[PDB]
């Protein structure tokens, strides 16, 4: 068998984007743009995205050993409704909360920083090969954890590179279909891993 | 037929590079560098590069929903002559206007921003596969538009993902050879597409 083990997985991440704009006498210029994929915590993936289909308007995560907190448009935390992404040929379903990137208002001879947090959730096809100790995603991101890792029936013996607090298993999980706003009638065992740049659920 | 449809295409883009430098008491350090590929508008590709073989010393384009304008060395707009790029084994012809990257002058305990705009034009080999609804370039950049898209003889029915204003077709186009400074004796139906990061002509 040379075909890699293929299984369905769902990614959850926020495209944190803070840009620096220089406002001249008659023009505007980008002095710097910092793009980062902030992962979504288990509490938000369960109690906000799966439970209500909404994402927090702020991105709280650890980056370079610092607890960074990004606010969309520098506004207070607010529940943003998830909507389907733009149509694309040969692409899996995906949803996002924001479309337009935010930049600061125009003030003369001054630098300003405008943060943008766009919650994004996508359904990606995961692949794995023998010894099945790790798997990749459709976006090309590697996940150093066995797809069968878990706490039940000896699954804890599988390979894992992340800390214990970075993995969570939920039993009787009813997947919420964001497009048709429906709830699966089959309780499923859902695994959750919070990678440094994204959160995957399979 | 498994061989992808191969055709010649020309890319046009400007390497906008603005760097932040911190000048210490006895040293210099880069506090941040922002590199971006600004596309070249149709007016410049026709009236400046093809018509006269020169590129504007400024990069005006849309990035993250903002009309950013970058000036080379923070100087006024000027016509820069295009010259061949450095020799490289197994590489297609390419030309550029600037070689040395610009940085701000040294002023003590102060941060400074120096913008660099280097117009770049290259001949790349484009490839496409069935249904031929999109094609890639030698640089690995995808172009979500059918290579045969156009306004003539039913070509408008081909697939396209960009807006109408982002595509332009020119009839009787005489390609200007920047190296031998020659004009082709054969009129061609040149197609032009302004992608968010570059402009391709085939």
């Amino acid at each position: 068998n040379i075909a890699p083990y293929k299984f369905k997985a769902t990614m959850y991440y926020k495209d944190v984007t803070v840009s620096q704009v220089w406002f001249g006498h008659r023009y505007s210029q980008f002095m710097g743009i910092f793009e980062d994929r902030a992962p979504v915590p288990f509490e938000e993936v369960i109690d906000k995205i799966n439970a209500k289909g909404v994402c927090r308007s702020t991105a709280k995560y650890v980056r370079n050993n610092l607890e960074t907190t990004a606010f969309h448009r520098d506004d207070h935390e607010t529940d943003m409704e998830l909507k389907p992404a733009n149509a694309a040929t040969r692409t899996s379903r995906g949803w996002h909360t924001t479309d337009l990137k935010y930049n600061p208002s125009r003030v003369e001879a001054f630098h300003r920083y405008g943060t943008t947090v766009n919650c994004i959730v996508e359904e990606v096809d995961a692949r794995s090969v023998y010894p099945y100790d790790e798997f990749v995603l459709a976006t090309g991101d590697f996940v150093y954890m066995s797809p069968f890792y878990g706490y039940r029936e000896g699954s804890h013996t599988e390979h894992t590179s992340y800390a214990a607090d970075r993995f969570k298993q939920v039993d009787g999980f009813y997947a919420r279909d964001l497009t048709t706003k429906a709830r699966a009638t089959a309780p499923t065992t859902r695994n959750l891993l919070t990678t440094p740049k994204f959160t995957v659920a399979w | 037929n498994i061989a992808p449809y191969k055709f010649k295409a020309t890319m046009y883009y400007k390497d906008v590079t603005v760097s932040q430098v911190w000048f210490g008491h006895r040293y210099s350090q880069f506090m941040g560098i922002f590199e971006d590929r600004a596309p070249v508008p149709f007016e410049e590709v026709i009236d400046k590069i093809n018509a006269k073989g020169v590129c504007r010393s400024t990069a005006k384009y849309v990035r993250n929903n903002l009309e950013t304008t970058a000036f080379h060395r923070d100087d006024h707009e000027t016509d820069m002559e295009l010259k061949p790029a450095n020799a490289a084994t197994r590489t297609s012809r390419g030309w550029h206007t600037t070689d040395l990257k610009y940085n701000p002058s040294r002023v003590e305990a102060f941060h400074r921003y120096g913008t660099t705009v280097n117009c770049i034009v290259e001949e790349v080999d484009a490839r496409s596969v069935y249904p031929y609804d999109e094609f890639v370039l030698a640089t690995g950049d995808f172009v979500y538009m059918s290579p045969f898209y156009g306004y003539r003889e039913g070509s408008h029915t081909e697939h396209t993902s960009y807006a109408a204003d982002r595509f332009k077709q020119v009839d009787g186009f005489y390609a200007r050879d920047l190296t031998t400074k020659a004009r082709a004796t054969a009129p061609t139906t040149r197609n032009l597409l302004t992608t968010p990061k570059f402009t391709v002509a085939w």
């Binding site: 495209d15 505007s28 992404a85 733009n86 694309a88 692409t91 995906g94 996002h96 479309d99 337009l100 990137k101 930049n103 208002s105 125009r106 766009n118 994004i120 459709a138 976006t139 090309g140 | 849309v62 929903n65 903002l66 009309e67 950049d141 995808f142 979500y144 993902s161 960009y162 807006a163 204003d165 982002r166 968010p196």
Partner: peptide
């Protein structure tokens, strides 16, 4: 898929200015 991110999760033509 990676290059389709901008066209799928963001507006490419809308311009905002003040």
């Amino acid at each position: 898929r990676n290059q389709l991110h901008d066209l799928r999760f963001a507006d490419i033509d809308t311009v905002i200015h003040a």
